[PDB]
Design a protein around this ligand. Structure first.
Ligand code: MG
Ligand code: ZN
Lengths: 1303, 49, 146
DNA sequence: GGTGCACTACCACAAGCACCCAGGTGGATGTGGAGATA
RNA sequence: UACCCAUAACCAUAUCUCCACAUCCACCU
DNA sequence: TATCTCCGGGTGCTTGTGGTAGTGCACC
């Protein structure tokens, strides 16, 4: 009944494995083809894993619900489903120990570091091959001193085991000259032809000779040491004190000559493989090793203490986590429940099986063969061989590939799939249960535009909607009398021939207030999931509101979308309130709206709010003469002056027509008197305006979509064409000053009128619309002439190939821009209403580059090598390209295709890294007592070598908007109180003030200085959301930050972002300074030597030829200043300057590339990920732990607080802030679930299993994994529970409260 | 597949977006009630009926 | 090549069959069994990578599928993972490989189709037709260059 | 008692190795086989 | 103990079959 | 004859190893 709070992972003892399993498996017999029932005690046995049938036992006497629990008469099975076979577990009792492959093959060898054993060769060779380790006795000498844990080959080992033995057959019937106890040296002539090899004793038989490097001792009395015992010097051998042992070795007494022979082999440990390891782990005690490592770490210098602590941390982890390392290797191997590896028939009796079954079968066979072999007899080499096969079988079962590649039966060279294969990998257990790849009430279909719909609605095909809401439909039509019961209703709906109009009435009844989530497959950011109100439609496709065509990256070229149906009322409220598309109009990446008018609406609105002008061939002077009104009216009566003329002060249009109200003007427009693009005098609410009726209509549209008109008039600019930027500003202002509902209604009205006027306006693209200016012709001639000159400049030898190439590239890239400028000059001069020029001027479609390609020329074309061709493309798509030019451009086409197909992959990987490293950060908080801030600059320190200038408006907006003031500032007679959120108006005021020249840096709060333990506080975070208002407490800023970072990456340089997020060493590292001083440049030709000169020292830096520096001699230089030009290694920068400097550098450098692509991204997210990126410190002055270890900055802060003030003992735990790449920070986390789920499950799980890691369920990934409620969002404790009661019951309960005070 | 269409992948990017909002129970139902909790899904179907 | 691999398998089989064979009047039966070569040919024509389902949606689809050139294949030549260096076109594709026919997606640049006038002569050497130009006259003589 | 010599601890470079190479959807076709014994 | 005292036995609760993997070809980013 | 049984390429990382200079023991 209790709730899950922590998940503990630790090693499993052999008795733990015995306790878990129900019985043991002996037969490698899965299932016979004939007997479809489980075969034997094999991997699918019934009574070892539970019944395979549904509810009946083997017999079925005591089974019924009166007496199910009473033990069965002919049976003993408690009533249960097959789910027991899903959970009940087996085990295998290996006759020989084996080691978990993870602890012996992981890069830090846990066995190899706990013991003084070499991982790469020693551990395996003792553990697989025939090598011997031995603790107790090594004092025997082989020309080598004593042994304690030394590894020796089994050849020399087996030698020293039983002395130094040699045997020589002797011919029978020949009495050799050597007697029984004769000492023999090398060269001594044992017979007419026999010679020994070494100093020893030769034993004679009738017919054999035995040369032993042993010592013989005659005696004539009783024996003290019998045959078999191994003796140490000074111990009595025989005859009492007359004969005593002289060396280590074994005693053999032969009474035939009444002699004691003592060999030189003492009883020494002999072990192979896992058992040996077990012995070691059995005799190892952790506390003494811990103390010894402590002394061996504290005294010596850093190099040895590095490995000392590397093993001491493991030892401490074992000691403090409970589980002792004796069961670090496994004796009994668990056996997975059968249903997790079922053998399922495919067709024709053949059974498809999981490879786990094959691995278990092989292991069972090897184990049984070992048991039989050890039972019958012991051929030593054969026993060792079969031990090796058993060991390799266990290792293969645990995982395949780390040692060879055990495979399926030959002919199918597919390596088998093992446990580690199931866990890890791009598609493992983690990367499918983290995902929930399958959902019940879902559908998908092609999408078509739904322009008739409002923004808070979407069209749903009636058939798939009927299918999706099937239980709701059944209940709702059961409310009426259409069907008696649920089965009849389901059968009625089970065929579409039984449909009725009453059914569709009920379906419309069900979904009156419901919402569904529409989803697009590549979900780059938060807006890829949006709720909608379904509207039943007759058709197949999904009708989609066009305005979300950019929220999703969803065009209508055939792409599909999915739909999901939330069930609980609580989830319905969630979706309808905070996911409905009407409530999400602004980006989370910045305040820029995403519900902005799209291409076609922009085109229509630009067409309706444009002013035309043609010509003035008459005396335009009109301000002066009042006769000019009549005279110029006559001129317009003739063809002297056009209606939309360029008069001096006024056009004849404003003179001729004047309108009392906008209604009158539009009514006169309806009579074809005047076009919407003609300026005319109109008397608005209080003023006379010279505007076109189109602009007046636009203003009226805005004023009608909203309620008040004064507000609408004050929030528009009716003096310019409505380009997409103007529309975006209009939408943002309306959202700011009106709210949600009115902004949505304004967007709907804008979309509708834009569609209508785009239709009636009639903009089409004809081949003649792509006008080719004639001026470019002569330009080409000029350029050609120049090229000829440059070419002859080469033929005189004045230039190199590189010089000529660069000159040609410069010439062509200049003339291209000249031509494009000429093209737009032509367009503005001659044909203002050209569809191409109109589309380019508005934000509808196209870019100046594309227009130049259409009408001008696509000059420079890139080579596959990355450079650009010498010969450009003269022709454009208005004309016809030559075959050769088309073949040339195919290079760039293919480059673009491949770059998409690969950079998308890279960017997705980057986004995954980000979202992992940031998933823990959610704003649950009180305002943290941060007396700290960041000073956002307003001036670029260096655009020229020495110059200061104000930063661009975009950068200042993206750095300051939505931030919280660190401290009060007054700049222009305005008191910006401390703690006031900076709106757009405040930022614009600050920019204007800096332009006047009053302040240069703004102190603001930031996540980079937030003191909240996990997450950031509301103040330190800021103000930007989908809304404008300050952030609600409890919403995941980390995930949205990561998504905002990653979303533009697909549409992008990027490797620079990679090497900045992942702290790396750039190849083009720039030389930097670390100490204050002066610059002494020496121009030595070998290598330019720059000296940072100080009072007591001088640092010398050598600069090669390519080292293009950027400082002048004698300049003062500080720490962290980049002396040369190039990228800066963040690590040495942190070593030199400090944390804040490197954080600022990272933020600015990351923002640089994003700006270079034109992407507008706020800096809150980069700051968040940077803060998570360097939340780690490595302690230098020890406290109660080792020194050269790095972990959480917050934890060390708490520990220092406890040590110094909370507890007695002023031990300063002096650390250094450590910067590591995003990957390492993501991996090394306190929680092991996320780390295991992220990159490498093997190493992470091994580390978390060495020491019991009680994973606390903080961070969203863990709660998703376990499936429990997310801490963020609605799960935040600040709003997790909120008692709700009506006013009348409130009065009842409060009346109970006042009477609770009795009398 | 052959018998029934099957569900739709909800992946992780969709999960990331769903938890990017304040949606908490939505993700819980869509990971357990509608996908995996056998007892949960049977009980939910019976209750909604 | 697949036929000769199967043939070598059959050769090893008949070598063994002779090895334990005693007498000699056993030429047809006790020497050659059709299982290896037949199985090898069947496997090549059924489960190979390059023997793929025909795309008979329309006659043009079938023709293009029949005259499509693939870079990947048996596996030791090129695979799907890493090919970014060779996906791009070459200056020699002019007149031999269509620089536009490649299918968008993962198999971009790897899979292509030869030009219309292309012709493999005897060994995978695409020859482009060219008209001989002698002095200032273009002769009807048409000659195929590698 | 101080420098020539030898030495040993430390850094830059080269080699071996584990691990990357995005998300979802539809469709199609393929699967213990040869020898030996009964 | 036999009147009390001595009693323990027989039937009705359901989401599943296969879909695995490999190879190949396409579609949408 | 039918069934049962043998037949990487690229990056970062880590580690290592020879090198190289500070400093410990012998000629000045
Ligand atoms: Mg599309
Ligand atoms: Zn804070």
């Amino acid at each position: 009944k209790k709730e899950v709070r922590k998940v503990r992972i630790a090693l499993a003892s052999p008795e733990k494995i015995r306790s878990w399993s129900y019985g043991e498996v002996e037969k490698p017999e899965t299932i016979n083809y004939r007997t479809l029932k489980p075969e034997r005690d094999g991997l699918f046995d019934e009574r070892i894993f539970g019944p395979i049938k549904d509810y009946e036992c083997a017999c079925g006497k005591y089974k019924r619900q009166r007496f199910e629990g009473k033990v069965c008469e002919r049976c003993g099975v408690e009533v249960t489903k097959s789910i027991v076979r899903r959970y009940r577990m087996g085990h295998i009792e290996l006759a020989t120990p084996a080691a978990h492959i993870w602890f012996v093959k992981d890069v830090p060898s846990k066995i190899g570091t706990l013991l003084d054993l070499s991982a790469t060769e020693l551990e395996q060779v003792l553990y697989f091959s025939k090598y011997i380790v031995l603790d107790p006795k090594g004092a025997i000498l082989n020309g080598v001193p004593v042994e304690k844990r030394q590894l020796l080959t089994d050849e020399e080992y087996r030698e020293l085991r039983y002395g130094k033995q040699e045997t020589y057959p002797l011919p029978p019937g020949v009495d050799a000259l050597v007697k029984d106890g004769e000492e023999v040296v090398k060269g001594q002539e044992l017979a007419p032809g026999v010679v020994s090899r070494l100093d020893g004793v030769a034993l004679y038989r009738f017919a054999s000779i035995l040369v032993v490097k042993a010592r013989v001792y005659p005696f004539e009395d009783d024996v003290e040491v019998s045959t078999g015992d191994r003796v140490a010097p000074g111990d009595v051998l025989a005859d009492g004190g007359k004969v005593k042992s002289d060396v280590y070795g074994r005693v053999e007494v032969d009474l035939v000559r009444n002699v004691v022979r003592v060999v030189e082999s003492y009883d020494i440990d002999a072990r192979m493989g896992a058992e040996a390891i077990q012995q070691l782990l059995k005799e190892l005690d952790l506390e003494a090793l811990e103390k010894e490592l402590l002394e061996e770490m504290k005294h010596p210098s850093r190099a040895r203490r590095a490995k000392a602590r590397k093993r001491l941390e493991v030892v401490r982890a074992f000691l403090d986590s409970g589980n002792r390392p004796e069961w670090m290797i496994l004796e009994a191997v668990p056996v997975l429940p059968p249903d997790l590896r079922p053998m399922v028939q495919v067709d024709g009796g053949r059974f498809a099986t999981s490879d786990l079954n094959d691995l278990y079968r092989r292991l069972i066979n090897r184990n049984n063969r070992l048991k039989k072999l050890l039972a019958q007899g012991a051929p030593e080499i054969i026993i060792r061989n079969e031990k090796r096969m058993l060991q390799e079988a266990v290792d293969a079962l645990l995982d395949n590939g780390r040692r060879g590649a055990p495979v399926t039966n030959p002919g199918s060279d597919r390596p088998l799939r093992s446990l580690t294969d199931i866990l890890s990998g791009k598609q493992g257990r983690f990367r499918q249960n983290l995902l929930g790849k399958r959902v019940d009430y879902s559908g998908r279909s092609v999408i078509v535009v739904g322009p008739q719909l409002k923004l808070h609605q979407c069209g749903l095909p009636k058939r798939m909607a009927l299918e999706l809401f099937k239980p709701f439909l059944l209940k709702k039509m059961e409310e009426k009398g259409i069907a008696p019961n649920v089965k009849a209703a389901r059968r009625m709906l089970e065929r579409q021939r039984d449909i009725k109009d009453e059914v569709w009435d009920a379906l419309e009844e069900v979904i009156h207030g419901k919402v569904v989530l529409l989803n697009r497959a590549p979900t780059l950011h938060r807006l890829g999931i949006q709720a909608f109100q379904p509207v039943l439609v007759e058709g197949q496709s999904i009708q989609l509101h066009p305005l979300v065509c950019e929220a999703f990256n969803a065009d209508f070229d055939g792409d599909q979308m999915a739909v999901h149906v939330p069930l609980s009322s609580f989830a319905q409220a969630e979706a309808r309130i905070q996911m409905l598309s009407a409530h999400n109009l602004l980006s989370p990446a910045s305040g820029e709206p995403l519900a902005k008018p799209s291409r076609d609406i922009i085109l229509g609105l630009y067409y309706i709010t444009q002013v035309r002008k043609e010509k003035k061939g008459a005396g335009l002077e009109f301000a002066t003469p009042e006769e000019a009104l009549a005279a110029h009216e006559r001129g317009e009566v003739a063809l002297n002056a056009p209606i939309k003329v360029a008069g001096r002060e006024t056009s004849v249009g404003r003179l001729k027509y004047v309108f009392a109200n906008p209604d009158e003007a539009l009514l006169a427009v309806a009579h074809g008197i005047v076009d919407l693009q003609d300026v005319v005098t109109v008397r608005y609410m209080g003023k006379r305006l010279e505007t076109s009726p189109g602009r007046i209509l636009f203003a009226r549209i805005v004023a009608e979509a909203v309620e008040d008109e004064k507000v609408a008039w004050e929030l528009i600019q009716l003096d310019v064409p409505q380009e997409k930027n103007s529309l975006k500003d209009l939408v943002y202002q309306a959202f700011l000053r009106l709210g949600m509902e009115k902004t949505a209604r304004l967007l709907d009205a804008l979309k509708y009128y834009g569609f209508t006027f785009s239709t009636t306006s009639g903009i089409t693209i004809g081949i003649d619309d792509a006008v080719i200016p004639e001026e470019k012709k002569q330009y080409l001639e000029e350029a050609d002439r120049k090229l000829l000159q440059i070419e002859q400049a080469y033929e005189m030898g004045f230039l190199t190939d590189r010089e000529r190439y660069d000159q040609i590239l410069q010439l062509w890239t200049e003339t291209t821009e000249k031509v494009t400028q000429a093209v737009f000059k032509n367009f503005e001069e001659n044909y203002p209403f050209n569809p191409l020029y109109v589309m380019a001027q508005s934000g509808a479609r196209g870019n100046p580059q594309q227009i130049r390609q259409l009408c001008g020329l696509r000059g420079l074309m890139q080579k596959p090598s990355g450079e650009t061709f010498e010969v450009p493309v003269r022709s454009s798509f208005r004309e016809g390209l030559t075959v050769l030019e088309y073949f040339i451009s195919s290079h760039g086409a293919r480059k673009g295709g491949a770059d998409t197909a690969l950079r998308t992959a890279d960017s997705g990987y980057l986004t995954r890294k980000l979202v992992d490293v940031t998933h823990e950060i959610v704003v649950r908080e009180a305002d943290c007592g941060t007396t700290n801030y960041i000073s956002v600059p307003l001036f670029q320190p260096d655009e020229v070598t020495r110059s200061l200038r104000l930063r661009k408006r975009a950068d200042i907006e993206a750095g300051l908007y939505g931030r919280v003031l660190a401290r009060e500032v007054e700049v222009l007679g305005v008191r910006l109180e401390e703690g006031r959120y900076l709106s757009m108006d405040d930022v614009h005021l600050l920019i204007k003030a800096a332009e006047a020249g009053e302040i240069q840096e703004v102190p603001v709060r930031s996540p980079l200085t937030c003191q909240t333990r996990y997450g950031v506080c509301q103040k330190c975070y800021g103000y930007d959301l989908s809304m404008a208002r300050p952030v609600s407490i409890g919403e995941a800023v980390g995930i949205v930050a990561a998504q905002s970072i990653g979303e533009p990456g697909t549409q992008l340089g990027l490797p620079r972002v990679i090497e900045l997020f992942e702290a790396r060493r750039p190849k083009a590292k720039a030389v930097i300074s670390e100490i204050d001083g002066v610059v002494r440049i020496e121009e030595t030709e070998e290598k330019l030597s720059v000296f940072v000169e100080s009072e007591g020292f001088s640092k010398e830096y050598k600069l090669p030829k390519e080292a293009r520096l950027l400082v002048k001699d004698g300049d003062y230089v500080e720490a962290g200043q980049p002396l040369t030009r190039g990228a800066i290694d963040p690590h040495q920068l942190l070593e030199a300057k400090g944390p804040e400097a490197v954080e600022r550098y990272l933020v600015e450098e990351i923002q640089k590339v994003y700006r270079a692509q034109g992407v507008k991204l706020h800096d809150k997210h980069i700051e968040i990920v940077v803060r998570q990126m360097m939340k780690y410190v490595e302690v230098t002055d020890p406290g109660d732990s080792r020194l050269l270890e790095g972990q959480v900055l917050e934890k060390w802060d708490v520990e220092a607080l406890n040590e110094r003030l909370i507890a007695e003992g002023k031990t300063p735990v002096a650390w250094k802030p450590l910067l590591m790449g995003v990957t390492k920070s993501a991996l090394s986390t306190k929680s092991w679930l996320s780390a295991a789920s992220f990159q490498n499950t093997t190493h992470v799980l091994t580390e978390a299993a060495i020491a019991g890691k009680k994973d606390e369920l903080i961070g969203l990934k863990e709660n998703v994994i376990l499936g429990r409620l997310i801490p963020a969002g609605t799960g935040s404790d600040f709003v997790r529970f909120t008692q709700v009661v009506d006013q009348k019951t409130l009065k009842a309960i409060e009346e109970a409260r006042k009477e609770a005070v009795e009398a | 597949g052959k018998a029934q269409f099957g569900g739709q992948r909800f992946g992780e990017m969709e999960v990331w977006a769903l938890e990017a909002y304040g949606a908490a129970h939505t993700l819980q139902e869509m990971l357990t009630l509608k996908s995996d909790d056998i007892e949960g899904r049977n009980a939910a179907y019976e209750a909604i009926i | 090549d697949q036929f000769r691999v199967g043939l070598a398998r059959l050769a090893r089989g008949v070598r063994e069959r002779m090895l334990m064979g005693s007498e000699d009047s056993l030429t047809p039966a006790k020497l050659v069994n059709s299982r290896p070569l037949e199985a090898a040919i069947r496997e090549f024509f059924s489960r190979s990578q390059l023997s793929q389902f025909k795309d008979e949606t329309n006659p043009l689809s079938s023709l293009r599928h029949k005259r499509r050139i693939s870079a990947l294949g048996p596996g030791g030549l090129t695979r799907e993972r890493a090919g970014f260096d060779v996906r791009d076109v070459h200056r020699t594709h002019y007149g031999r490989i269509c620089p536009v026919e490649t299918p968008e997606g993962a198999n971009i640049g790897l899979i292509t189709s030869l030009a219309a006038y292309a012709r493999v002569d005897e060994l995978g050497f695409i020859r482009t037709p060219y008209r001989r130009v002698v002095g200032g006259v273009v002769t009807d003589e048409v000659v195929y260059m590698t």
